[PDB]
Design a protein around this ligand. Structure first.
Ligand SMILES: [Mg+2]
Ligand SMILES: [Mg+2]
Ligand SMILES: [Mg+2]
Ligand code: NI
Lengths: 249, 249, 249
């Protein structure tokens, strides 16, 4: 015969679709009657088409009644290929899946603003704020005075160490000075310090530089100092050169 | 009847596909005649198949003439399920979409070579170049002399503070020295400095250490110094011990 | 006629599917006979359906015998549209492809725990361990004594520079002291040092502060020192004020 406008028949329960090898179309009206059968592509009421092209080729299609999908298969040399199941718009939408073209760094959302760094070295120049403390090998200040304070350092003494000169301890302000003066016999001579004492002279002394006669007085005196001058007294009966020292601040 | 080699008919305009409930196949020759109708799966000329399996099941397929897609649906207990639309090769190609297997760090393109780091601490040991300046709590040099210069520090004085000894200010080079010497009556005695002055002796003095007789001269003298020796003159009429001091550089 | 339960015929080799413009269904039993033909959707044995809707519309479907896929096309005004090829479950599974919803940072696998950082500055406060060495502008210690050692620094001298006072070099321990004392004529007077020498007095001297008569002895003496006192001898025949200096440690 031919394919008719009426279906060839209704599939009852327990139909093995492998046995439907005659051309036509058949309706399965009941999902449960599909469940109780065999080789249904999906447990679902549906429409089956059979095209028995030849003994060696039996083609079948199945349209699920609820649009679950549409299936097809074929029997080639007494072996049924598996049912193919169509993909349709009720399964998935491609727009929901990431294109390879949308897979790159700047497109990836949720990226942290900052990243936990690995082991890196720095140059000192990238220290741009803060003052390194002593506990870290620093000097705990950004001033010279403050640095010394942190590490208990003093300042350099200064001096001019000439034949007549001075020496100054800048930690405390102490100045010490020296010079020579020719004195008249049994008399005074004034000296002028190489530099002035900023505040006052605290003391001095004088010393006979010559091979004075040991049978007579050769005393010395340091007195009447100012910030700039002092009086050296020579107790030797001849004119003589006396050296002196003086200190102050 | 049966499905014929000729189509059952041409669909004109204004056809509600819900009304095509008789088995057969019908052609819509004009996209616009689909537009003017109802329940077409797509506004597009196409081929419609109707399989009226039973009163309760009416199956339909629609093949768009331009291959837009292929559609199917069914009427179950007087309600039409929605049209299913097939996915085909003209819609998309899976090769353009990212597999889950190709979603990992090393595959992600456009990754920066370096990343903005978050708050991290360092150990000092990862400072491997540069010289920390004073403005940062550093000493602004990698030399001892250069460090002191930055912070205005002096160097330690050195000394040997024995009964006879010396003291040296290494900031300026000033050396001061002391000792004792037994002198003959009314005569000279030579002393040798604990260390030699590197350059010259700048001055000295001597002092009577004994309870000399106050009814006679007991003068002192320091003279004729070299880098290593000096002459101490004793103006007392007895042999006596005189202490001395001397300074230089 | 009508579509029959028997296929209209077997397609031999060398069939141009463009020529199959009569309604019916035909079977290609041999993949190689498809290879030797034209306009087959796939080189594969299969079932062909032709629906000659009208002169202007010829619809075709092709079901591959091995389920490779299912194809359809149409001839509109003497031009064949391309074959559409169905996507099915044997081609791909959507579950293997990444959803846009699963494309974010925390989902991306294989992320490194740490990231190579870019150029950043630090505040000194994020140095939280280690001691900066001199080679980096540090002081190579976390102690004051150790810092000075690294950079060769000395400590501050201390002093009290009053009319009678003292000065101490704390690098070496040397103390120097000064004062004045009224002495009886031709006699001794005891002095007490402004501070005690911690260990011993190493030396001293005295100096006549007055305009003594140059026709008589005005000698001086420093002797018998302890840590706290000394004896100043005045060789002048009048009572007189003598200044002194003393040093020790
Ligand atoms: Mg004499
Ligand atoms: Mg006398
Ligand atoms: Mg005299
Ligand atoms: Ni860092």
């Amino acid at each position: 015969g031919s394919f008719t406008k009426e279906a060839d028949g209704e599939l009852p329960g327990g139909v093995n679709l492998d046995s439907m090898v005659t051309s036509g179309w058949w309706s399965q009206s009941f999902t449960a009657q599909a469940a109780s059968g065999a080789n249904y592509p999906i447990v679902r009421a549906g429409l089956l088409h059979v095209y028995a092209a030849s003994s060696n080729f039996i083609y079948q299609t199945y349209q699920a009644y609820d649009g679950e999908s549409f299936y097809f298969r074929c029997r080639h040399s007494n072996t049924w290929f598996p049912w193919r199941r169509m993909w349709h718009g009720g399964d998935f939408n491609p727009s929901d899946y990431l294109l390879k073209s949308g897979f790159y760094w700047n497109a990836l959302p949720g990226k942290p603003a900052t990243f936990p760094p690995s082991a890196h070295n720095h140059d000192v120049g990238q220290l741009t704020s803060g003052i390194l403390p002593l506990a870290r090998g620093g000097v705990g200040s950004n001033t010279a005075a403050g640095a010394r304070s942190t590490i208990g350092a003093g300042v350099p003494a200064t001096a001019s160490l000439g034949a007549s000169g001075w020496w100054r301890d800048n930690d405390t302000g102490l100045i010490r000075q020296w010079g020579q003066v020719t004195c008249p016999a049994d008399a005074d001579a004034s000296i002028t310090f190489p530099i002035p004492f900023p505040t006052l002279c605290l003391g001095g002394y004088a010393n006979q530089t010559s091979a004075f006669h040991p049978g007579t007085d050769a005393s010395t005196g340091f007195r009447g100092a100012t910030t700039t001058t002092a009086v050296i007294r020579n107790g030797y009966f001849a004119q003589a050169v006396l050296s002196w020292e003086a200190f102050g601040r």
